[PDB]
């Protein structure tokens, strides 16, 4: 049992750290519209889409009752971009940097909960 405001307080700074990354977070700030991006085969590969705005809205309303529910949403977001994008692409590289950032922020947060 974590009460919702404690979870928000502990985890929100970890989402803030990602969101503030410029230019790396930009492709992750909103859902991927595959037709407007000219990538009409996106949902045939990526089965469960996730992005920072979805993660923020769920965290804002208290949908995450356990820390693991939040960590898993963030790794789903990362894993989706690593799957669809080539290892030599701008987007792939942006993804990995964000993850490096996330791991620094998240480790101590999990160690003291
Ligand atoms: C980092 O420094 C600044 C300084 C000022 N702004 C402002 C405004 C309007 O002044 C919006 C933003 C801002 O970044 N808004 C925002 C919010 C969500 C998504 C984007 C965005 C832009 N391109 N993409 C792909 C996503 C976006 F630009 C911003 C950032």
How far, in Å, is the centroid of ligand 1 from the Cα of 51?
Answer: 16
Question: For residues 95 and 112, what is the distance between their CA atoms, to the nearest angstrom?
Answer: 27
Angle subtended by helix axes 90-111 and 67-84, to nearest 10: 160
Residue 47: phi and psi, rounded to 5, are -80, -40
- Residues for the chain: how many in total? 113
Q: Are 51 and 28 in contact (CB under 8 A)?
A: yes
Which of 20, 22, 26 best tests ligand 1's pocket when mutated (most atoms within 8 Å of CB)?
Answer: 26
Resolution to 1 decimal, in Å?
A: 2.4
Contact in structure between 83 and 75 (CB atoms under 8 Å) = no
- Where in the sequence is the domain holding 31, given as residue range(s)? 1-113
Provide CB contacts within 8 A for 70, sequence distance 6+.
Answer: 7, 11, 55, 59, 64
Tally the domains of the chain.
1
Q: Is the CB of 20 under 6 A from ligand 1?
A: no
Residue of 21, 27, 31, 29 lying closest to 97 (CA atoms): 21
Biggest alpha carbon–alpha carbon distance for the chain:
45
Closest by CA to 2, choosing from 59, 53, 54, 55, is 59
Here the tokens at position 4 are: 């919702």
């Amino acid at each position: 049992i974590f009460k919702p405001e404690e979870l928000r307080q502990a985890l929100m700074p970890t989402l803030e750290a990602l969101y503030r990354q410029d230019p790396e977070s930009l492709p992750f700030r909103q859902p991927v519209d595959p037709q407007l991006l000219g990538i009409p085969d996106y949902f045939d590969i990526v089965k469960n889409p996730m992005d920072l705005s979805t993660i923020k809205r769920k965290l804002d309303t208290g949908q995450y009752q356990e820390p693991w529910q939040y960590v898993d949403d963030v790794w789903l977001m990362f894993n989706n971009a690593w799957l669809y994008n080539r290892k030599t692409s701008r987007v792939y590289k942006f993804c990995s940097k964000l993850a490096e950032v996330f791991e620094q922020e998240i480790d101590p947060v999990m160690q003291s909960l």
